[PDB]
Amino acid sequence: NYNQEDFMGLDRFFQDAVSHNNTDANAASSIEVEMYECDCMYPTFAEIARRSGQPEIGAMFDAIAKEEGMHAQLLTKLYSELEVKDSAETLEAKRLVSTIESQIDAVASDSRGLRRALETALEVETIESQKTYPAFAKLAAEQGNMEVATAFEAIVKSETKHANWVKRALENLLEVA
Ligand SMILES: [Fe+3]
Numbered sequence: 566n567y568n569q570e571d572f573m574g575l576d577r578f579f580q581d582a583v584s585h586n587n588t589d590a591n592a593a594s595s596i597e598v599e600m601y602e603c604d605c606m607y608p609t610f611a612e613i614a615r616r617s618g619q620p621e622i623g624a625m626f627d628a629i630a631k632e633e634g635m636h637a638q639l640l641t642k643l644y645s646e647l648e649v650k651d652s653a654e655t656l657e658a659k660r661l662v663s664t665i666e667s668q669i670d671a672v673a674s675d676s677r678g679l680r681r682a683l684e685t686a687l688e689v690e691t692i693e694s695q696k697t698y699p700a701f702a703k704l705a706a707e708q709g710n711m712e713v714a715t716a717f718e719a720i721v722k723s724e725t726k727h728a729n730w731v732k733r734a735l736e737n738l739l740e741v742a
Pocket residue numbers: 598599602633636693724
């Protein structure tokens with residue numbers, strides 16, 4: 566059962582935090598992904614938006630990026646000593662970032678570049694808000710880590726808001742008049 570892969574592999578920018586038995590390790594994985602989104606993924610989407618002639622959508626992605634760093638920093642405050650390193654999958658994503666950056670004028674000139682960037686943002690925001698962070702919050706609570714559970718609950722709310730922002734932006738982008 567073969568499906569075509571997305572235009573320029575843009576879907577592979579989405580990175581999911583990894584599930585563990587221990588809430589520290591879920592936190593470490595979250596920090597890693599949220600900082601990748603803050604540092605790498607959303608800034609690249611922002612530049613695709615600007616180069617596409619969509620500076621308002623670019624500003625949205627810059628605003629979201631800052632918030633991803635807030636999520637990371639909330640967790641790092643709770644886990645002051647944790648040493649976060651990029652996994653093989655994050656490193657591969659950062660390589661894809663760099664290859665798209667090198668081709669950024671071609672990606673932006675095609676209407677699909679920004680469309681797929683917004684659809685990929687929607688994909689992560691949906692998975693993180695509806696699946697990954699609820700599961701981390703639930704496990705934190707089960708383990709008696711109330712402060713971390715409450716942090717994950719706040720990140721769930723925030724990622725939900727990002728999903729809504731991204732859907733309204735996508736609805737805009739596509740509607741010409
Ligand atoms: Fe995120």
